[PDB]
Amino acid sequence: GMEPRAVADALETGEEDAVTEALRSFNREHSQSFTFDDAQQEDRKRLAKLLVSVLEQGLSPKHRVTWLQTIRILSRDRSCLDSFASRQSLHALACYADIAISPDMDVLLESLKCLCNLVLSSPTAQMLAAEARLVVRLAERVGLYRKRSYPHEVQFFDLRLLFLLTALRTDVRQQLFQELHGVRLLTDALELTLGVAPKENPLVILPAQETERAMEILKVLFNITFDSVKREVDEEDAALYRYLGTLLRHCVMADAAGDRTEEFHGHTVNLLGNLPLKCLDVLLALELHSLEFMGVNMDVINALLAFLEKRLHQTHRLKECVAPVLSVLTECARMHRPARKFLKAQVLPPTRPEVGDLLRNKLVRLMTHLDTDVKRVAAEFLFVLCSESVPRFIKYTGYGNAAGLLAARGLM
């Protein structure tokens, strides 16, 4: 490959053969991160200003993927990306991604890759991406993922771009939730990706690519629901959320190809914690396909229990990662007596509860955690398992830990 200053000098001579050959040479050496050199930064910024001028006038269909690939490489550098944060620049990339509001697969992927880098780091690009309404045809392409057909990497970066837009812009988040039927659209995309219907066999194992797309779908669903779901919900919004919860029930029961299972269960449970509390009853709505407890299938509740144990092993200071699963389990225990007795039997058999490495000793230690969120939910979880009896709660957890649920907060 050749150095940025050489590429810029190649364009200055203007011979079409030296230009493309310089771009493709640069694209091969700099496609990996070990090539990026602090010393060549001003040459990269110089090259970025040249290329945004070309991109904004338009890219010829041949060499189009070559130009975008250079822009995509340059966009990894923070100091070069503002050169591209313009209406004309984003609009040009939106067209080559075919999400401009007004089918070359490799041009599509490179533009989506460019747009992901641009909006991620620039408040101006975030403002321009919202104004350009890229979310509309981004969502419409996701809905047509069955009728139409796109490669997995295009599908992934559509969802990644959708994730970034909903994460970085409140107004894009509201648009997808309130006016673009985002929950229904992405619940549909999740079922297609999972390959199972709500009422079918519990999904056992998900392929690696489907896991990547499904996790992105779960993250977008998290974005548009952590903010906008009032906890009281009508009959139409209850059924979709129950429909979605049944898909999340599959995710809980299943593993992900490779070692992505716990990350896959992390995004599933995070979303479960966003649903209206009443819709969590789907987690107890399994038939026997095998863990029976007082007539109720506890396999889902047992699976959330295993995930809770796994993540308590694997987190030093980030115990907050288990607050979603604890609140889901708490409301299951609070709403359903058989789930409460099972969880108490599994966690709390009949002197210093904070000592040990059984599951109950680890949960009790969370009751005094630094993160206020996780110390209160772990406290309420065990309090509910104790049938909300303060004496029993104190006996099983010790008064120093149980005080975080009584007003005796502040004596300690």
Curated annotation (Swiss-Prot):
Consequence recorded when altering L168W: Does not affect ability to fold GNAQ
Keyword terms, alphabetized: Chaperone, Cytoplasm, Guanine-nucleotide releasing factor, Phosphoprotein
Subcellular location: Cytoplasm, Cell cortex; Cytoplasm
Mutagenesis or variant effect for R376A: Does not greatly affect ability to fold GNAQ
Outcome of swapping A403W: Does not greatly affect ability to fold GNAQ
Gene Ontology MF terms in the entry: G-protein alpha-subunit binding; GTPase activator activity; guanyl-nucleotide exchange factor activity; protein folding chaperone
GO cellular component entries: cell cortex; cytoplasm; membrane; plasma membrane
GO biological process: adenylate cyclase-inhibiting G protein-coupled receptor signaling pathway; basement membrane organization; cell migration involved in gastrulation; cell-cell adhesion involved in gastrulation; G protein-coupled receptor signaling pathway; gastrulation; in utero embryonic development; response to light stimulus
Functional summary from the UniProt entry: Chaperone that specifically binds and folds nascent G alpha proteins prior to G protein heterotrimer formation, promoting their stability and activity: folds GNAI1, GNAO1, GNA13 and GNAQ. Does not fold G(s) G-alpha proteins GNAS nor GNAL. Also acts as a guanine nucleotide exchange factor (GEF) for G alpha proteins by stimulating exchange of bound GDP for free GTP.
Similarity remark: Belongs to the synembryn family.
Subunit structure, as described in the record: Interacts with GDP-bound G alpha proteins GNAI1, GNAO1 and GNAQ, and with GNA13 with lower affinity. Does not interact with G-alpha proteins when they are in complex with subunits beta and gamma. Interacts (via C-terminus) with RGS14; the interaction stimulates the dissociation of the complex between RGS14 and the active GTP-bound form of GNAI1. Interacts with NCS1; interaction is favored in the absence of Ca(2+) and myristoylation of NCS1 is not required.
Protein known as: Chaperone Ric-8A
Organism: Rattus norvegicus (Rat)
Native organism taxonomy: Eukaryota, Metazoa, Chordata, Craniata, Vertebrata
Full-protein interval shown: 1 to 425 of 530
